[PDB]
Design a binder for these strands. Sequence first.
RNA 1: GUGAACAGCCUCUAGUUGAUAGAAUAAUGUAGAUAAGGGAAGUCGGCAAAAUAGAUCCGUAACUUCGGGAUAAGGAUUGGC
RNA 2: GUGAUUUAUGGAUUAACGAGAUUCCCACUGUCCCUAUCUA
RNA 3: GCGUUGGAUUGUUCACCCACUAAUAGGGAUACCCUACUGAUGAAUGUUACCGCAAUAGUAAUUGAACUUAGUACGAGAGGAACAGUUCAUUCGGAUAAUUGGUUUUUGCGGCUGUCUGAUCA
RNA 4: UGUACAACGGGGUAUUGUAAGCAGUAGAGUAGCCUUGUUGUUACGAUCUGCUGAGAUUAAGCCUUUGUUGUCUGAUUUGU
Lengths: 38, 50, 137, 360, 136, 96, 227
Amino acid sequence: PEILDGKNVYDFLDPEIAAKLQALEEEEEKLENEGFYN
Amino acid sequence: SLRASSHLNAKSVKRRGVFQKAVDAREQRISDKLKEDLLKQKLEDLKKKE
Amino acid sequence: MRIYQCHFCSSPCYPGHGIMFVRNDAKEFRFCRSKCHKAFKQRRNPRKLKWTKAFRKAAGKELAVDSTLTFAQRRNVPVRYNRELVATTLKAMARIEEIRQKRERAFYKNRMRGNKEKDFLRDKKLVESNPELLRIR
Amino acid sequence: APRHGHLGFLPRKRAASIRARVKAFPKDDRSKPVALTSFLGYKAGMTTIVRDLDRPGSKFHKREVVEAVTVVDTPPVVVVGVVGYVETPRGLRSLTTVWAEHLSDEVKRRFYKNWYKSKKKAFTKYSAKYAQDGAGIERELARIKKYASVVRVLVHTQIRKTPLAQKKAHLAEIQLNGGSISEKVDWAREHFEKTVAVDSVFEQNEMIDAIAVTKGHGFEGVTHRWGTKKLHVMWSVARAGQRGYHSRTSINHKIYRVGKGDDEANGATSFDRTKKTITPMGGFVHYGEIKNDFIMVKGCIPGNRKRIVTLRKSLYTNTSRKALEEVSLKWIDTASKFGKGRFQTPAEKHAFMGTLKKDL
Amino acid sequence: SGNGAQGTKFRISLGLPVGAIMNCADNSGARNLYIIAVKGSGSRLNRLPAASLGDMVMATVKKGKPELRKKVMPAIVVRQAKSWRRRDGVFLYFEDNAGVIANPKGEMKGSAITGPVGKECADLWPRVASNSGVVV
Amino acid sequence: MGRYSVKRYKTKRRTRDLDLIYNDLSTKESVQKLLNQPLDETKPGLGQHYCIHCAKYMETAIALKTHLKGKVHKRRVKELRGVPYTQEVSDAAAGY
Amino acid sequence: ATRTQFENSNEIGVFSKLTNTYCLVAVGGSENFYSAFEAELGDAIPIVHTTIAGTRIIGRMTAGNRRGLLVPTQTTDQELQHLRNSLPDSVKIQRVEERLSALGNVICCNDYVALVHPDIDRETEELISDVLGVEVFRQTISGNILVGSYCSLSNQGGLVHPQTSVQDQEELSSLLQVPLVAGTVNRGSSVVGAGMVVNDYLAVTGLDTTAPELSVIESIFRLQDAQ
RNA sequence: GUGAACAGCCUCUAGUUGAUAGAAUAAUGUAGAUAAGGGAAGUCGGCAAAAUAGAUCCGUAACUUCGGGAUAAGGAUUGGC
RNA sequence: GUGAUUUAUGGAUUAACGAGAUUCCCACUGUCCCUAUCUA
RNA sequence: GCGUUGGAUUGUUCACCCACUAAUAGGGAUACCCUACUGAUGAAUGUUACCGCAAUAGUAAUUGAACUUAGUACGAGAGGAACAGUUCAUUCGGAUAAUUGGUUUUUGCGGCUGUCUGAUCA
RNA sequence: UGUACAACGGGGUAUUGUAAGCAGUAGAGUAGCCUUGUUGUUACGAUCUGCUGAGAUUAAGCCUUUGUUGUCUGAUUUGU
Ligand SMILES: [Zn+2]
């Protein structure tokens, strides 16, 4: 595919990207419940 | 030149080759769609008939 | 391809648009458009300018530094083109921009909260300083 | 030196109709089924395209290269009637027309010229002639089955299905390149009040001919008309006159795409994976949207935007490799041409700008 | 076009008429050129023969070593100072006009180069590609 | 669009850069060599009297003395305090 | 040893590149030079149709060894991806950011040691030793500053342009650690990096390369089983 | 007011609002302008257009009937609080 | 007669000046490659 | 059938060089007024409209270079085309505004000097 | 007398480049009522910082419209 709406993927592409996605999944799991997005 | 006999017949044998066969298969390929369009509109007409 | 950004604006120069100017010091300045091109010819300073992005990310508007911003730096190490990582990166990049939108909307809110209090204070200045329209109505 | 002009298109006058009229067709082949020889739609704007290149031997083999295309609105096209034509020692002769028992308001509005004051009585006797039996119709049809070595069909567009508002339908005649003229008219009779795609005539990896009328430019004199220098009478002495609005014919036109209205993400290559139709930001420039099929062809057709064109399927069996190469798109620019466009989608606009004062 | 020029040239914009001064990017110490001529010329009335990147000229040296001055020798253009279009989609330009000296065959006169050369001339002339320190 | 743009800011009259002058200030040896540039007859100031900050060759000492107490030198010496704006922040300001 | 002709040019190492574990080739014209290489070597190692920013010149815009490989800023993600997909993952691949890009012009390298410009940056000078494990030196040859153009190296031997004096020859043979010869290729073509290419078990040269030239390179690179 | 000014620009006192009008923007003309890249190659011919031009600091050769040439050349500077 | 100066169809010379005549150097630029646009 | 150049030199055509390209062959032939040429409407054909035919007239494409064949046969070698397959390019013509660059009364948006409406604003 | 047509308005695109109105413990500085500071505070003060990618413009030969408000029967000529 090599392309998205923007910021084409070869600057994104590495392994452990799902691990990073979980590393941010926990972060949004923190901030969703704190009322920060009021 | 465009219109020299040598380049011309040398192009005619090649036209008799791969290109006309590609076109002869292309016309059957597109005749398939050209005929099934009638079927699509006719099943729409069946949805009208019911 | 690349969507390589404007040297002067950090704005995306899609393929076909703009200019790649290349100096005696053998460095490309790929440009979004003529406006930014003529300004760079004119030796303007975007950090001083207000419509650009270097100034914005320097000036305490939307955060320059974060991991959601920094996930996409570069890769000078190719990765052998497996399919199954890409099958998930397509969702990763999708959700990253959603969370980034949420974060920067929250940052705009962090910049623009306390606006209604000063709005009411200026309107209170108005109603206290002009009670004559209140005699009228 | 050369002559500061051509001589072929010498009576440089305006044409008589904006419909550039088909004059040539490739002859026939009476072994195939019927294939329509032409089609027609309305030019809308231009875009830019990059394309990975399977051209064996060329300098740009297996490379990305940017090129430039046009786009035309190509709705489905309904058939309304036929005509026959017979060889004489004068030329050809229209000997019968036959129509298709129910006609749209659009074509009834074409044949009339001041619509709303009209009683719109266009075919009210013809539909009455379409009796319980269609006797006179079959009379004047099997005649053509006997005679009429070559046969054409009438078409009209569905122009209400375009962003454009003219309300009027552009007739034409179209030649066939099948055999068995009885089968031709039988096919067409079944196709009466039935409509036809553009992916059912054309496909990718194709060459076409584009015949249209140019943009007008008024009465420009010699220096910009012929590109001649600046400080009895012969007809080639580069005298001023009307430019533009001539008919022309442009050939060897490589299609890249045969679009589809129902297909969402018409701008999608295999590469982008973005749900965007090719209608870019801002709408087209003096044309609207593309919610129908379409064509993406390289070069630049004669015309201006929101102008009609007619299409022909290259009129002979081409010989160049470029007539047979295999196309593969990599990316459609989808930016607004109402300015130096930067952004494909308004969601990308939101993403790169952020939220704003009017946003909340 | 001449000998040595492997591959064909694709059409580019044309910036350099005759009488157009340019830099000498060589390591001989020669400093400038003054074009008089082009090889691969078009034929038309009242024209100025144009040169561009990848092209090969005959020209003088107006400033450089005196042994080479008041003498004519060939040259290749290396920097255009005018905007062109590589098909892999981008417009670009270098700032300055520059041309280096070389024999009629295509072999480079000097042994080294200062500054950037265009992708076109680099791809075209292998001895440029061997003696050049830079690409773009 | 006009005459001032083309009479000051064409591609024949360009300055050296903002960046290389910053790196020249950082590097000790560079200002030494730039001051010890020898004579050349092909300049009016004859290959000397070069201001490092304002990259121009004056012809005498008074054109340095009056130039240093001026509003043009203020510009360069104020801009050379902060960051020299290389391509890094241009990359950085949109998530690169 | 074999002479070989690119399309009508005798200079090979401007249009192609070699290592002990793989080989590169441009895609200019027709697929005959790749067949020419595989006629000698075969499927012992990968031979790869490759490009650099759509350019034909890989032989002078690239530098590497059997341990690792380097490419300049101008190259593209597509070419980098294709290089890793084509080549085994045993060898490194890496894209470099510099002011100047003429890597094969300015790197004459073999698997253990390589030479570079004096003004090359110390960042990439560290990185090349990091990726290849090779000792780096920043020198010239007879004042001729392009090192990757006028030198061709191997672990068997090497070569330099003929104008080098003998003091330069010996003091460079010290640094380079193989026997050297101030030699020629194609009737005195000064550009030896492009005029010929060499690895520990093959050399390739233009058709104009003569029999004395073949003999001296054959001896110095010790290529047959009787040298 | 401006600024050296009785140059030019704007304004108050005072006086005209007269010059056949209207609708349309096709060329070419007439006056006025801008144009990349090169920079007099064009042309009999630097014809015309265009370049610096104002004020201060330094500085200004040969030649001379010593009186000048000289706004010589040429470099820097010019806002507001 | 002749036209300042040094030294009489008048001889060698000459600073300044001339809407006096000729060649060339700088920059300048649509004179030109190559023409394009806009305004009353 | 299609093409035949850029410069250098004289009021002068006489005279004769440099370099490119495939070549840079020789010759001839005030003006609104009526005509010719370039373009534009137009009643009459019982009407008005749509689609088409095509008597006739004009006619445009050109050249070089290159991968392969092929370092082929031939030649002792130096040297070396070829036919076919394939790609580019030149000069000409016709279109087009995606993109780039040029253009500004969008007088759209800012900014500026002097001045006028007391000052800001506009 | 409608899949209607238009005049405005909204939305989309783009254009420029961050408005009037204020507020500040930024603001070289000079005076200043004297609570004689030890950021004394008060005066002026080019500008800077924030409400502000803000403001204005947008078809006259751009896109889009379930909004509002109006128009929707004037003259003439024609026959085998
Ligand atoms: Zn920008």
